[PDB]
Amino acid sequence: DVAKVMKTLDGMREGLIQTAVELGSIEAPTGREGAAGDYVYEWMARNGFGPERVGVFDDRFNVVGRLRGTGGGASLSFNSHLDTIEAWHEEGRIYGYSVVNCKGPMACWLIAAKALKEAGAALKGDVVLTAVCGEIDCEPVDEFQGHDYLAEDIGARYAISHGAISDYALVAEATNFKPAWVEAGKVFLKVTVFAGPSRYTPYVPRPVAALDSPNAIVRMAKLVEALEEWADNYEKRYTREYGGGTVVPKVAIGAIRGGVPYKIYRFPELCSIYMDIRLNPDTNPLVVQREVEAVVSKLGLKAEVKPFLFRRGYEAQGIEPLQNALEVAHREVVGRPTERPGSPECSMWRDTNPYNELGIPSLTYGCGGNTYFLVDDMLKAAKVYAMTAMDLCNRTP
Amino acid sequence: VAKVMKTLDGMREGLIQTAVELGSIEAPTGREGAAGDYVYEWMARNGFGPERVGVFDDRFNVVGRLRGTGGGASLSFNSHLDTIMHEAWHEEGRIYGYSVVNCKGPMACWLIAAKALKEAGAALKGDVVLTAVCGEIDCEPVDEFQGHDYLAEDIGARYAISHGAISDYALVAEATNFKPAWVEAGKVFLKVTVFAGPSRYTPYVPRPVAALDSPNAIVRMAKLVEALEEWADNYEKRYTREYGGGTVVPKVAIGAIRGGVPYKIYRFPELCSIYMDIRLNPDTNPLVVQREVEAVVSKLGLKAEVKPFLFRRGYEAQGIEPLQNALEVAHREVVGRPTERPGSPECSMWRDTNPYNELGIPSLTYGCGGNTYFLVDDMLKAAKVYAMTAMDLCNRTP
Amino acid sequence: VTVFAGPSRYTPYVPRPVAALDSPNAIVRMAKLVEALEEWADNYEKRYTREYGGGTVVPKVAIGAIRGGVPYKIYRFPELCSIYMDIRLNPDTNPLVVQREVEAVVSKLGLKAEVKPFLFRRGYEAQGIEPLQNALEVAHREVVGRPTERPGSPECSMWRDTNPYNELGIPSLTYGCGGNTYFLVDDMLKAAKVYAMTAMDLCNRTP
């Protein structure tokens, strides 16, 4: 019964706060999420959710458990990520950027599952509890390979693919009670401009115009300028409205390197930049590659434009039952109808992408959002999650 | 074309060497590194600029390119480095070796087709992307079997494509006997654990009890296996489904069982597990299938945990026509007849077309052969078809 | 007990429908053989029940483990499947008599199987136990105050370390307090009193 589960949740304010502070206190940047995973595993296990470590590495794993229902109903997943980029309680607030992103929203649905199980809520469908590693957009490239540098490939997609499947999925993040169900994809490009010939410094030819410099670092100044302008218009041209949100796909030059600092007496013939280019769900990464290649050709430069990452974005298909259950729960607990998210929270990576890629309609929703969470807002989110499940998991599929 | 054709005729020996050397390297899933190294070094000698793209230092994909002049569609050729685990050798215009059939033979064909394209100086506006992948075979981790040694598809083609080996179209070379497919099945694996008990020391076992009521989970599992076979018989019929890219007959099989442990048998088990491979047509939700199996369990008045431990989607290629067409035209010239359609099993299985199609790269599977050997004549033809297909398609505008 | 079947195929090639005793999957044949062996076990214990001075032996059977295939490679079903049977013996049954019986269950289903023993231990009835029986009974009556009752058949149809003692010519019986969650300290002090007396009696008799 809804009425019972609410009061049960009210009697768990202290477990909620403890769970958040304990989780938020564990150091868990991408690459080193094991300890957080171990915490959540032992939390799920003490509470009877039969967790499993589901991972490609024994110190970087996802944690998957279940609240099994009586049979026949739709199954719902709750999802949050274990990685980050101390946490403490003070006057109804929990402080810590580790709580905002993303241990706070995680505590909410952990506690919501605890409330459902102890109140004996009648659920025909399963609730799937999925805490994942490697959500943040780190990726390997060049000499940086394997274990230390991996992320999304071993996170949520790996977990779902290895059994953490459901009919619908709610990804809990700091959205301030605004739901989204479109996200951007991405293509990363390594762009290497060619120049030369390289000389020992006392032999460097000057003066030469920047586009003609034997130093690829100096040509790269010109190409950076062109690519910035291209980026200013890229985001306008590929802005696109969906039912699940408006996607404004942005571009940024995330890194540059040319030469090696410990050998600078001979300037380099190569220089590389690394571009983060977001994609709306309807853009082929190759269309974008040719565009960058064209900026390059229009400057009369020669360059290698090499993709080293491609992920698709998705708009959820058939999200309405989850959207509805959530909207209804939201209106009772928060008391207002839901507002629509800004375009940045629809033009991101979120673990809705892998769920939607695998045919599990998925939206993202949770409290908060930048320094702290209101415990009241967290109890509210946990109430919403608990209701959403009681609705949706009793509908037949 | 006629030049590329004769360049290829003059590489008969390189084709045979490449296949035999590759097929001789021992490479079951889990231990594909050495095959990968062969191919990396092969691609390097031939100027294709290889890169190792892997999540592990000894299990990696290998990706290279033949760069075009600009303005064309890009085509990927793909084959897998792993094998099941024979040996490989040349004999009478045949190459013997199960590792040649699956899948170093088809691989050599397109390595050689790329060598031929590059040396004859063929004019290609688009890039040819050369992708040799690890972990194609359907091994998956489960239970205590985790990580490096048991992984496969998650670190293979999908990983390579996601990490830059993208193109407009993709041909996956496999032993298909010159019949192209562009639908494959997906899959859901289910661990089904039947509950029984209470467990007793053998001198205390209650008898007689009816099998469905036995305190021993191995004995309840005898009945459930009989029921799941019945279900499996009808499952494939009910979910048979026709696509443009082929007919999918999705089949079911119980691949493993274990209950109790052999070194402690003096107390019969309260749990017994089976592991089912259930193929899916591209349009079946894995949960629909889960509920069907859960329902077989309920119909017997048994209690069981039905736990999925693998889900992959199957796909039918969308917008395959330009590649379908380049291939068909190339095939008719080199092989001399139109392509026949593949049987339903070869459309109802896993092929690395699935990851390509999932990522929006229309992809079909095609190559010579298909059990024990390849005719070298059939290989040279496949290499010719690949070369021609690239020559057509990589000059169409994208 | 390993049942043979095959040939093994990749899942998209599995032949259906086929009757369970004829399935290429040894796991599926094994379902049928398990059923037969259970029935055989229901009667095995009745047929080989046997009364001794030291207790009644009701020898039981149980299938303690099964394994077929490997879980991390399930895309090709197995040609072999094995079960592991715990078959108790009364002291007077040759293990080979029992092996042929299981082999016969197998042949009667028209299955082919390897029936391989991997453990044999003999049971024993103590011979010449009376002096220890007597010393114990006497001590028991003084400390516990009642004469001893006879055990149920499961505690006579078990393994106990009386077997090795009796095998080596040292007459041996089993006795102590208790029996399932806890012991009464009083019952333990009683047992210790019985043991101490039994020794004072028996260790002063000449052999």
Swiss-Prot record, chain A:
Its cofactor is Co(2+); Mn(2+); Zn(2+); Fe(2+). GO terms for molecular function: hydrolase activity; metal ion binding. Divalent metal cations. Co(2+), Mn(2+), Zn(2+), Fe(2+) or Ni(2+). Keywords: Hydrolase, Metal-binding. It is an enzyme of class 3 (hydrolase). The keyword Hydrolase applies. Optimum temperature is degrees Celsius. Optimum pH is 7.2. The active site is at residues 83, 135. InterPro entries: Peptidase_M20 (IPR002933), Peptidase_M20_dimer (IPR011650), Peptidase_M20A (IPR050072). It catalyses: 5-nitroanthranilate + H2O + H(+) = 5-nitrosalicylate + NH4(+). Its EC number is 3.5.99.8. Belongs to the peptidase M20A family. Catalyzes the deamination of 5-nitroanthranilate (5NAA) to 5-nitrosalicylate (5NSA), the first step in biodegradation of 5-nitroanthranilate. This is 5-nitroanthranilic acid aminohydrolase. It comes from Bradyrhizobium sp.
